[PDB]
Design a binder for this molecule. Structure first.
Ligand SMILES: Cn1nc(-c2cnc(N)c(-n3ccc(C(N)=O)n3)n2)nc1C1(c2ccccc2)CC1
Length: 830
């Protein structure tokens, strides 16, 4: 049983558990055991949870960020149902009470003993919330559809639970012995070495002597740093760069000066270097696992004798020891040395009256002076809990201190499961900045994953998608193993998704081959013939959607499956569910060959924009569809059904009802056929609302190469963008407006200023709302720099956001510049 589970984790994570053992690494073995226990403790707490608490784990509530409606209800072991006319203001309890009353009359004779399952979905309705606060109810109030729900008794949820169980004394300078190399280049070799605490140098970067190019260069040179051994901060990083000069970079490598047990390192170290794109402080402190092709830098850390980093009780003991200022008020809304001295002097007054300025003072503390650090740490240890927004900033590489990091985690505990889900992608990326395997962020990510099955799901996939990346393969694999130990049943549920994805990779490889060799109907027929095989039928059916674990992908609709003509021949896979009805008619797009990490970020940023607008009582009818990277240049996209491209509608194909005399009318003619009579006016308003949100979103995010093939419309009138290959103006893009879209907004009239001026106001509002949250976008995109995205490489990518959101300016200057940008787009629109 314990063996099968081990062989199951190895297959699921993609790395044999034997590989973790073969390292003989005390750091790896300590994490594995400690985390396993932590995760088994979390699995044990789950089985003693009440049946409602376990519903909150397995099926977290999908909520929205007077008017009656039909609702169809049935009980678990029966085909018999009942349709009620309930209210949107009614709680699930009133609905369940009605449902029990109808059962009593029919069966000829307690609501609190039940929960309402969404038919053929892992989504439930419970809690003291009116029906219109539920995402599903709204997914029915807008599509016009009738909600279908099932009464599930407490004992039936408890049957589910059960089946789902398992020092300051050393004032001498820091120096090293640079022994030799084992590399390749075309010229002389030089080694640059620097000591860092995050983004900043602790002292000036020291260089090596020029040694002539060869495969095994020798230096045996002592490199001395302008810093005392007693002044090395705990998270100090000794960074190396190997380059060939007459400059040409070759390789880089980093290492922490203290180990995971806080002991200062001695003596011989062999550094398996990483290929270069000069000094890279942000890069991994673990050497290249490719010890066969990797260049190796041999160094010696000289013995100073065992020296451990002083415990917090020693740091604290040390640390304890005019109206003109502020002054510091005016610089607290990127500063000179005199202003940094002001902040350091005022450090106590910052804790007292500006706790949120913690990040500004953390940047001014002299981390290369052990007494200056202790003083900061004494203040930090009494520092009030910071807001989530300020805490998100402290996760950055600019704040590498472990005590700062621990303080940031302590402040993100108050994060709701909804807020955590929204920023889960960025928190996972921050793991790349981590210096040790055992960290507060891993423990936080795991603890929250094991207490919420949806968080658990996405933590797994974010990590699993990066297993082909050698710099994060050990960390991510170890975290996923610890997770699986905390959820044996979820492990198998995820295995079912990997098996389905394995079949789609094999199926898509054939589609790629066949498309270059025969006609599309010939390829489609054999794709279908291959799908109908027992192993493909078994693997592609009855799984949880990796895009949303609450979507149940039941029976695969082979006849409705196809592939798109684009570069990578993406697979279009359709599913159906008898039990779910129309909610079970769901599609997935399997794309293989492109990097979907950016597309996901872009879709997540739009999803956030929609959330923020909804918070301010604005629903700009956005379509933030799923996009999940699953593997190496592999992922899934959610099919937005009953939609088509602008190019397909505008292609003006004959015989159809959408036939237009003029191109400008093609969109409005298509909407007239999909929404006839009284339904048209509703479609136009959906179009206008969705158009305004995407106008602002694409402008703020700087989305370029926008044509009729990457813009879509739902039959409801809602416009949305697809295929986000590029963002942040990276090929300063303007605001975009189209005459044919402006035509739909103006009701199909050449002149209709009342409709266009309403539209212009939507664009202004949406923009002004996002501007207030401009710092959230800044912090989240700054965190996303860790990912390794070519279009989010530096500060010049972060700058696009600053300018698109006009963050340095006031609202009146920003709204004027937006009015200038909107009119520039209108004049350009013919
Ligand atoms: C009817 N339909 N619906 C879609 C659609 C829906 N939802 C999406 N998310 C999406 N999509 C595509 C690529 C990306 C992306 N994010 O990269 N997103 N496409 N596409 C089609 C057409 C189609 C389908 C299948 C075969 C031929 C032709 C073109 C008509």
């Amino acid at each position: 049983v314990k063996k099968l589970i081990n062989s199951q984790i190895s297959l699921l994570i993609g790395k044999g558990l034997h590989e973790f053992d073969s390292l003989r690494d005390p750091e790896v073995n300590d994490f594995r055991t400690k985390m396993r226990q932590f995760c088994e403790e979390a699995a044990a707490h789950r089985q003693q949870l009440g049946w409602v608490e376990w519903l909150q784990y397995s099926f977290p509530l999908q909520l929205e960020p007077n008017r009656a409606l039909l609702v169809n209800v049935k009980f678990e072991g029966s085909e018999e149902s009942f349709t009620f006319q309930v209210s949107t203001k009614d709680m699930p309890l009133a609905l369940m009470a009605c449902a029990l009353r109808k059962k009593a009359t029919v069966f000829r004779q307690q609501p609190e003993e039940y929960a309402l399952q969404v038919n053929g979905r892992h989504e439930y309705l419970y809690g003291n919330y009116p029906l219109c606060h539920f995402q599903y109810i709204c997914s029915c109030l807008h599509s016009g559809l009738t909600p279908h729900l099932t009464m599930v008794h407490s004992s039936s949820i408890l049957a589910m639970r059960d089946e789902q169980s398992n020092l300051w004394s050393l004032e001498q300078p820091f120096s090293i012995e640079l022994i030799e190399g084992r590399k390749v280049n075309a010229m002389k070799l030089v080694v640059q070495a620097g000591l860092f605490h995050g983004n900043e140098m602790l002292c000036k970067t020291v260089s090596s002597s020029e040694v002539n190019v060869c495969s095994e260069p020798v230096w045996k040179q002592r490199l001395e740093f302008d810093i005392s051994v007693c002044d090395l901060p705990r998270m100090a990083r000794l960074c190396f760069a190997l380059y060939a000069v007459v400059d040409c970079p070759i390789a880089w490598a980093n290492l922490m000066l203290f180990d995971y047990k806080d002991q200062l390192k001695t003596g011989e170290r062999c550094l398996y270097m990483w290929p270069s794109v000069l000094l890279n402080p942000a890069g991994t402190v673990r050497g290249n696992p490719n010890t066969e092709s990797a260049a190796a830098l041999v160094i010696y850390l000289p013995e100073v004798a065992p020296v451990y980093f002083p415990a917090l009780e020693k740091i604290l003991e040390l640390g304890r020891h005019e109206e003109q200022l502020q002054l510091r008020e005016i610089l607290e809304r990127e500063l000179y040395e005199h202003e940094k001295d002001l902040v350091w002097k005022m450090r106590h007054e910052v804790q007292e009256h500006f706790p949120e300025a913690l990040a500004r003072l953390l940047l001014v503390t002299k981390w290369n002076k052990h007494e200056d650090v202790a003083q900061m740490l004494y203040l930090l240890c009494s520092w009030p809990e910071l807001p989530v927004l300020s805490a998100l900033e402290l996760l950055d590489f600019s704040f590498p201190d472990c005590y700062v990091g621990s303080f940031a985690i302590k402040s993100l505990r108050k994060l709701t499961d909804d807020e955590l889900f929204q920023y889960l992608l960025q928190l996972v990326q921050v793991l790349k900045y981590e210096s040790y395997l055992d960290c507060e962020l891993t423990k936080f990510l795991l603890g929250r994953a094991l207490a919420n099955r949806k968080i658990g799901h996405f933590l797994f996939w974010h990590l699993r998608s990066e297993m082909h990346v050698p710099s994060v393969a050990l960390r991510f694999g170890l975290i996923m193993e610890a997770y699986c130990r905390g959820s044996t049943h979820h492990m198998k549920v995820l295995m079912k998704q990997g098996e389905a994805l394995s079949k789609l990779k094999a199926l898509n490889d054939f589609v790629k081959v066949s498309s270059q060799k025969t006609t599309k109907p010939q390829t489609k027929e054999m794709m279908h013939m291959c799908m109908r095989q027992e192993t493909y039928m078994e693997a592609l059916s009855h799984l949880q959607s990796p895009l949303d674990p609450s979507t149940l992908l039941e029976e695969v609709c082979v006849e409705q499956c196809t592939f798109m003509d684009s570069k990578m021949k993406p697979l279009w896979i359709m599913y159906s569910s008898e039990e779910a009805g129309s909610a079970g008619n769901v599609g997935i797009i399997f794309k293989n060959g492109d990097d979907l990490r950016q597309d996901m970020l872009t879709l997540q940023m739009i999803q956030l924009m929609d959330v923020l607008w909804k918070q301010e009582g604005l629903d700009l009818r956005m379509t933030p569809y799923g996009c999940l990277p699953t593997g190496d240049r592999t992922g899934l996209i959610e099919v937005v059904l009953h939609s088509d491209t602008i190019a397909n509608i505008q292609l003006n194909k004959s015989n159809m009802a959408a036939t237009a005399a003029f191109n400008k009318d093609a969109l409005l003619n298509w909407l007239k056929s999909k929404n006839p009579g009284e339904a048209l006016d509703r479609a136009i308003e959906e179009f206008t609302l969705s158009c305004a949100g995407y106008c602002v979103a694409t402008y703020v995010l700087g989305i370029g190469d926008r044509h009729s093939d990457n813009i879509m419309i739902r039959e409801s009138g809602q416009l949305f963008h697809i295929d986000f290959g590029h963002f942040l103006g990276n090929f300063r893009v303007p605001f975009i407006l189209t005459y044919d879209f402006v035509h739909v907004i103006q009701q199909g009239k050449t002149n209709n200023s009342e409709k266009f001026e309403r539209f212009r106001g939507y664009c202004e509002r949406a923009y002004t709302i996002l501007r207030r949250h401009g710092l959230l976008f800044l912090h989240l995109f700054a965190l996303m720099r860790a990912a390794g995205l070519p279009e989010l490489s530096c500060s010049k990518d972060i700058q696009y956001l600053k300018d698109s959101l006009a963050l340095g300016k006031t609202e009146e200057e920003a709204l004027k510049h937006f009015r200038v940008k909107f009119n520039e787009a209108l004049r350009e629109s013919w």
